[PDB]
Amino acid sequence: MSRSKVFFDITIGGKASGRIVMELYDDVVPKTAGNFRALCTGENGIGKSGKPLHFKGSKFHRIIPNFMIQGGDFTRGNGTGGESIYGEKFPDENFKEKHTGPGVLSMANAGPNTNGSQFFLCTVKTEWLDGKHVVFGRVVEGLDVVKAVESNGSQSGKPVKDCMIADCGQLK
Numbered sequence: 705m706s707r708s709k710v711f712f713d714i715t716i717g718g719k720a721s722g723r724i725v726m727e728l729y730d731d732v733v734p735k736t737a738g739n740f741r742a743l744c745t746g747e748n749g750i751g752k753s754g755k756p757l758h759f760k761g762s763k764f765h766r767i768i769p770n771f772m773i774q775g776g777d778f779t780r781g782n783g784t785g786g787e788s789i790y791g792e793k794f795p796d797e798n799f800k801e802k803h804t805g806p807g808v809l810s811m812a813n814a815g816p817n818t819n820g821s822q823f824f825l826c827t828v829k830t831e832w833l834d835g836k837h838v839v840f841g842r843v844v845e846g847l848d849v850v851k852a853v854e855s856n857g858s859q860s861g862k863p864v865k866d867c868m869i870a871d872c873g874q875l876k
């Protein structure tokens with residue numbers, strides 16, 4: 705069945721750098737896709753954390769060259785935070801989709817069954833994450849914008865400048 709389309713407009717050090725367009729796999733992982741969709745639109749308002757359940761304004765706090773760009777921590781901004789629309793953590797829905805190449809959209813976590821709002825966009829094939837992170841979508845436009853963000857990461861994960869999701873939402 706159906707697939708939602710969502711976007712991020714990115715700034716890097718405040719400079720507009722383009723739009724990333726993502727297709728979600730609502731047909732394979734509807735609960736996982738649906739959480740991410742709602743966090744793009746902001747439609748579930750204020751969460752248990754007291755902060756908006758919305759990626760807008762948040763950053764890619766962890767970026768690793770030749771690996772992936774990671775965001776979604778809109779409560780702590782640093783990898784410790786994030787909150788799903790379901791309330792904090794939800795189980796791994798399935799591992800039907802794999803990490804096959806750059807562009808893959810997958811959930812960051814802290815171990816089995818700990819999905820929140822943190823996610824990553826792969827800049828390479830990361831087969832070693834298969835069966836441990838739930839893949840729920842892929843980039844279909846703006847992979848160049850993904851690369852631009854990637855150039856600001858470091859081996860340590862720390863970005864050299866703020867890569868921000870200046871706007872986001874759903875297209876259809």
Ligand code: PRO
Pocket residue numbers: 766772774811812813824833837
């Ligand atoms: O941040 C990390 O290193 C792992 C791989 C991406 C999701 N969690």
